Design a protein around this ligand. Structure first.
Ligand SMILES: [Cu+2]
Ligand SMILES: [Cu+2]
Ligand SMILES: [Zn+2]
Ligand SMILES: [Zn+2]
Lengths: 153, 153
């Protein structure tokens, strides 16, 4: 199964995020190409609960957290399903790469199809900051771009 | 369960389409508010197979037709699942209304979540025209606006 999200916003940030999972027990491969970010930085990358674009990126809601855990790093045992950490931007402000993830799924009760992908304006503290907010959002900041995850061929 | 699609394009057409279904056997209520259309006309309204927005409204693919039937009217026995017919625009070019549909579903194997909603620039001939194209698209024409159907609260 394949899915894709086109990140759009009004801050000059945009990109494409592709998802791919063969079966439900298999990990999902996430590939992304995002431009318009600050050069040479880390930017929070997450899947938010709602694929609602009526109110910009705001209506996407909180991080997809069906298991009611606190915010963390993709590699943490305790993290939100939608926690993809930080993406690295080069000197031209382009973030590009891919990775596999076992919590994010395109099949089953926790499918992210129809939900949102959000790129933040700030760095994700991975739930290590000493603030209550660290545990919810990772203090990643504003959401310059987002896209609803849709099915593709 | 509730879902929504925000129709965007570069032709001045835009709107919001909301979906609502309590259980899978129940009909889905579709509500829509679209502006920027030709005044006092009929415009093809359909759910296309892919929620792929990488290539404008083109990448949304054909009408959602899991049962491999020909194009028809919402009331026809033989129609594509995604066949919502024509929406009527007033003197200000606004199409607004709602209806229930038993083929369109937000739950189950034929869920339209993650797929696309497309408003056309032309009138849907409801598969009555005498052209082969009538049976595929209804000769509805160009796709000025579309949106990926996402989950909401
Ligand atoms: Cu986020
Ligand atoms: Cu159509
Ligand atoms: Zn999180
Ligand atoms: Zn059709």
């Amino acid at each position: 199964v394949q899915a894709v999200a086109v990140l759009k916003g009004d801050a000059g940030v945009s990109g494409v995020v592709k998802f791919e999972q063969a079966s439900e027990s298999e990990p999902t491969t996430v590939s992304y190409e995002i431009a318009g970010n600050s050069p040479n930085a880390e930017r929070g990358f997450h899947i938010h609960e709602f694929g609602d674009a009526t109110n910009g990126c705001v209506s996407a809601g909180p991080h997809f957290n069906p298991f009611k855990k606190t915010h963390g790093a993709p590699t943490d045992e305790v993290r939100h399903v939608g926690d993809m950490g930080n993406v690295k931007t080069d000197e031209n402000g382009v973030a590009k790469g891919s990775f596999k993830d076992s919590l994010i799924k395109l099949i089953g009760p926790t499918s992210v199809v129809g939900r949102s992908v959000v790129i933040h304006a700030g760095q994700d503290d991975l739930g290590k900051g000493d603030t209550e907010e660290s545990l919810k959002t990772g203090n990643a900041g504003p959401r310059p771009a987002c896209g609803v995850i849709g099915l593709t061929n």
